[PDB]
Write a protein that binds this ligand. Structure first.
Ligand SMILES: COc1ncnc(C2CC2)c1-c1ncc2cnn(Cc3ccc(-c4nc(C(F)(F)F)cn4C(C)C)cc3)c2n1
Ligand SMILES: *NC[C@H](*)CS(C)(=O)=O
Ligand SMILES: [Zn+2]
Lengths: 602, 75, 331
């Protein structure tokens, strides 16, 4: 549809999670935790106690939230599903993306795995379920090889959960349709339509034989299903609010449940009156992953809406109460540190700087045009710091800011990217002239200055950081291409830029032609010879003073006589000689219609 | 700011707008989504019809406010 | 009378004449404006114009009841003077054009409400001012539930009318109120931006009634984009409406249909408006019309039975005059 250019202001190494964690996996052979964050980054962590720093690597090729991750082929391969509509294949040992599947139309929320078939399913908000053979998904690129699509059809509403049997014989979908759907993935056939949930279903589990499903809904219920009888066989009410995370032991007898109420229970499925409270978490539980290194699970990893991931020890799960209120463990055994998310952004009147407030209550100052932090202001008041940095200037808006990833993302569209003309002096650049600059143009030329097609190199005024990711997406969250600013010189990146860069970027960046000037009309009337005028939006009031002094009073330096002889009024306010007509029309002109100016003699 | 508009079939759509947006710009964004010309459109908020030539701030339209889209039935 | 293009105003004036308290509230406001004028504006001409219309109507009703051999020219009964006051308040009513009856109802009720607020501010500078606010004004609760974080958000917004769909993208009026008020999932291009998630997510959205007026007006969307098309098929209209399903609190209040405004025409650009009204309450023959229905043509009043009126309204027969405004009254 319409391609937008975006980029992310970040450090070269985002070592800590910058937002909540949606998905967890373990590699028990490597003692290695994977954390798929809302910051669009999948991190690899060591879980050995002797390691002081758990960080191992960062896997960064998404452009929105990573909703689910699956570890496959003995921990060699990772599959990632994102709100960028992509499913990605990675090398888990090395940490790089080696394929991207674009067959979805909306956010991909759930993955499923069948260990004994190497079969992965992907589902999303587009009501589609795709089945993939993982040995087939291990192809380098579409040019080396491209693959077909197996689809399960029959879902009537958005899919928030998949579950697949370990033997790849049953797949189950949970959706806002409130009914679980069951297929055989081998034949793509329907089997069942389980009914009894009253809201969305975000957690699904199956046992190894596919005979029993365990499901957790946002209605606060856990239902055990008998897939041999097409019915619910038990219901458990142990959460005050929606159940979002489930885990089960290998015997399929104990269920670890967590959700919006910030509690984790272990319920016996055979005797659901005996439950234990493991812990009381600080934020809603998004995902849990059991430690499976022993017969009774010795630990549980808990991902939340907060940037920290905790390990809770399960030792001492046997007391006697049916609903004990004393948690077994009141401190985590292991804590993966998180960073701070940006939660407010405020674009200043120059349309070049942002003030941001984070979760830690720290205010930061950013330059969009250079894509960098200027200073960290500490824990200053945000609305007072906005007031201190008020400037009497108007620049048309020319970018959007998104905080989805907990870090600044700046977006440019054809509609408004080019609407910001500014003097070199006003933009803090100089040479011995005052040339007129377009901010969206200079930024597009800096963002892809490493493209061989753009050399004659860069805008000649500023460079963005070489690590700055550049994204070409569509309005709606569908990403077409992502690269780093420095990677545009490679053969594959240069071909994907020839196939992806929109013409509205090519005209300014490659053809090096310059955007339309905006002009505002105004009336120049004597303050108590009339004509309607048009001039550049940026024309200083000093050149309107000159025009009046030379066209109405044509009877030493001429510009000094012009400024000291004529005054300009608008809404009975005397205009600043240096104000641009934009800033006059935006602040000093509260009346409706075309801008009117009045004049008199000193 | 995001606002909802209830269309002719009762279906809700979302518009992204600014408090300084005029009613004519909101009717242009409703033309871009629902394909109805602005001269045939009629917006109602809080039981008052929105008049062309005013801004969304004049009506107290916030984030998550609902507009009802209707047409003239000439008689 | 008609006197050219005014059938849209006539239908609204006829339904407002039989509204529970409208005729007494307009008399209270007109007596205040008359006491203002004796002690010493364009908005006050609307209330003077309405009082003069209402007095003309009681003089016709009396004259028909006791002296049929009078008012042979129908006394020249004129909305045209009220229409001139609405030109001074709103430029759209200029010439002999055609207009929406709901847009005229909004203009009259808004200008009466502005007059009520002006008289209230004048009196406070040195109880019956809430005429429109008691009769036609209600309050909704618009809940939004983000499916990612399960946070509720409420907005509390006023309503004068309930605008409902007539067809999907036969039906009953309960289905149209369910499409207006019941839980809608916003998904795909129209995702909710959730300030707790900092993200575009699916959301459930529900509208519930919190304060109900004495008169519920349903504005039927008898029109769809195919270049615009009038939907000629009605939906089934109940005589009794209960709104407990979409209510914030349970209430054993029932609402009863007492007026309809119909539009006869195959296009949205032209047609004839008609009103029909139940006579519940206001010389022996006056009480005999109770329970029946009055149908207003351009200058004819036809008395019709409730059964025959509802048979003619039902989609089982070709209606030829599509319902457009339904008025339900508190019992
Ligand atoms: C601009 O016109 C209007 N503006 C506001 N309101 C009204 C009408 C008052 C709604 C009109 C309006 N339009 C058209 C006409 C035509 N003739 N007349 C006078 C008239 C009105 C009511 C009756 C009448 N009343 C009753 C009973 F219900 F009380 F029993 C029985 N009958 C009948 C069945 C004998 C008798 C005569 C009209 N008046
Ligand atoms: N649409 C105006 C009413 C029709 S008429 C014939 O009464 O003017
Ligand atoms: Zn949310």
């Amino acid at each position: 549809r319409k391609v937008q250019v975006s980029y992310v202001i970040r450090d070269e190494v985002e070592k800590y999670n910058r937002n909540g964690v949606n998905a967890l996996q373990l590699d028990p052979a490597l003692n290695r935790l994977f954390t798929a964050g809302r910051d669009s980054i999948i991190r690899i962590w060591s879980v050995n106690q002797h390691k002081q720093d758990p960080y191992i690597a960062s896997m960064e090729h998404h452009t929105d939230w990573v909703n689910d991750i699956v570890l496959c082929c003995n921990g060699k391969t990772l599959i990632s599903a994102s709100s960028d509509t992509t499913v990605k294949v990675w090398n888990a040992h090395k940490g790089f993306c080696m394929s991207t599947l674009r067959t979805h139309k909306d956010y991909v929320k759930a993955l499923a795995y069948a260990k004994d078939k190497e079969l992965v399913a992907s589902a999303g908000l587009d009501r589609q379920i795709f089945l993939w053979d993982v040995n087939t998904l291990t192809a380098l690129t579409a040019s080396n090889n491209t693959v077909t699509t197996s689809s399960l059809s029959g879902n009537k509403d958005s899919i928030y959960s998949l579950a697949m049997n370990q033997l790849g014989t049953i797949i189950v979908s949970g959706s806002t349709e409130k009914v679980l759907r069951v297929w055989d993935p081998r034949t793509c056939a329907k089997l069942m339509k389980l009914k009894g949930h009253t809201d969305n279903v975000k957690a699904l589990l199956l046992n190894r034989d596919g005979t029993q499903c365990l499901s957790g809904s946002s209605d606060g219920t856990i239902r055990l299903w008998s897939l041999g009888q097409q019915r619910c066989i038990a219901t458990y009410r142990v959460h005050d609010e929606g159940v979002w995370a489930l885990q089960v032991n290998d015997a399929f007898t104990h269920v670890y449940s967590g959700g919006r109420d910030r509690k984790i229970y272990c319920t016996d499925l055979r005797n659901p009156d005996i439950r234990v409270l493991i812990c009381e978490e600080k934020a809603p539980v998004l995902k849990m992953e059991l430690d499976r290194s022993a017969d009774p699970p010795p630990a549980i990893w808990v991902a939340t809406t907060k940037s920290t991931v905790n390990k809770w020890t399960l030792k001492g799960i046997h007391n006697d109460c049916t609903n004990p209120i004393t948690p077994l463990c009141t401190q985590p055994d292991q804590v993966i540190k998180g960073g701070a998310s940006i939660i407010q952004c405020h674009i200043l009147n120059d349309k070049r700087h942002i003030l941001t407030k984070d979760t830690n209550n720290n205010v930061a100052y950013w330059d969009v045009l250079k894509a960098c932090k200027v200073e960290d202001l500490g824990k200053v008041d945000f609305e007072d710091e906005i007031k201190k940095r008020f400037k009497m200037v108007y620049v048309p808006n020319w970018f959007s800011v998104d905080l989805k990833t907990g870090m600044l993302t700046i977006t440019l569209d054809e509609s408004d990217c080019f609407a910001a003309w500014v003097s070199a002096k006003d933009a803090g650049f100089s040479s011995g002239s005052d040339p007129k600059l377009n901010l969206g143009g200079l930024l597009l030329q800096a963002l892809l200055e490493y493209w061989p097609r753009t050399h004659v190199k860069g805008n000649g005024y500023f460079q963005v950081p070489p690590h700055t990711p550049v994204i070409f997406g569509e309005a709606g969250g569908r990403t077409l291409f992502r690269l780093l600013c420095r990677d545009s010189g490679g053969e594959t990146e240069s071909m994907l830029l020839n196939e992806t860069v929109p013409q509205w970027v090519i005209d300014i960046t490659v053809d090096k032609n310059m955007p339309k000037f905006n002009k505002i009309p105004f009336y120049l009337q004597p303050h108590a010879k009339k004509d309607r005028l048009s001039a550049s939006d940026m024309l200083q009031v000093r050149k309107v003073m000159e025009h009046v002094y030379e066209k109405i009073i044509n009877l030493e330096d001429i510009a000094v006589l012009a400024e000291e002889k004529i005054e300009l009024l608008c809404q009975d306010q005397v205009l600043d000689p240096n104000m641009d007509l934009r800033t006059v029309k935006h602040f000093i002109w509260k009346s409706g219609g075309d801008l009117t100016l009045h004049y008199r003699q000193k | 700011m995001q606002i909802f508009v209830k269309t002719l079939t009762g279906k809700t759509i979302t518009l992204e707008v600014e408090p300084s947006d005029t009613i004519e710009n909101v009717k242009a964004k409703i033309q871009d989504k629902e394909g109805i010309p602005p001269d045939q459109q009629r917006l109602i908020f809080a039981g008052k019809q929105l008049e062309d030539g005013r801004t969304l701030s004049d009506y107290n339209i916030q984030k998550e406010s609902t507009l009802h889209l209707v047409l003239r039935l000439r008689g | 009378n008609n006197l050219g293009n005014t059938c849209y105003l006539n239908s609204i004036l006829q339904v407002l004449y039989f509204c529970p308290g409208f005729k007494s509230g307009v008399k209270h406001l007109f007596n205040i404006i008359s006491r203002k004028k004796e002690a010493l504006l364009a908005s006050y001409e609307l209330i003077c114009s309405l009082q003069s219309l209402i007095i003309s109507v009681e003089q016709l009703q009396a004259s028909f009841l006791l002296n049929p051999e009078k008012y042979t020219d129908e006394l020249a009964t004129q909305p045209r003077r009220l229409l001139n006051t609405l030109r001074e308040l709103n430029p759209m009513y200029e010439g002999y054009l055609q207009h929406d009856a709901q847009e005229v109802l909004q203009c009259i009720l808004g200008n009466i409400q502005e007059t009520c607020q002006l008289l209230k501010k004048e009196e406070v500078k040195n109880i019956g001012f809430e005429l429109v606010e008691k009769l036609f004004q209600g309050q909704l609760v618009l809940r939004t539930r983000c499916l990612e974080c399960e946070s509720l958000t409420e907005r509390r917004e006023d309503f004068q009318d309930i605008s409902v769909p007539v067809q999907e993208d036969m039906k009953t009026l309960r289905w149209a109120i369910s499409q207006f008020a019941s839980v809608e999932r916003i998904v795909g291009e129209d995702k909710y931006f959730c300030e707790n998630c900092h993200h575009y997510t699916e959301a459930e959205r529900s509208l519930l009634f919190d304060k109900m007026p004495e008169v519920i007006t349903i504005h039927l969307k008898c029109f769809a984009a195919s270049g615009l098309s009038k939907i000629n098929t009605p939906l089934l209209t109940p005589l009794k409406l209960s709104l407990e399903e979409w209510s914030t609190k349970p209430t054993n209040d029932s609402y009863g249909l007492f007026a309809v405004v119909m539009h006869s025409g195959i296009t949205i650009s032209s047609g004839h408006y008609t009103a029909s009204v139940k006579v519940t309450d206001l010389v022996q023959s006056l009480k005999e019309y109770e329970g029946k229905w009055l149908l207003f043509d351009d200058s004819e009043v036809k008395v019709t039975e409730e059964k025959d009126f509802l048979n003619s309204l039902s989609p089982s027969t070709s209606p030829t005059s599509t319902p457009y405004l339904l008025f339900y009254k508190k019992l």
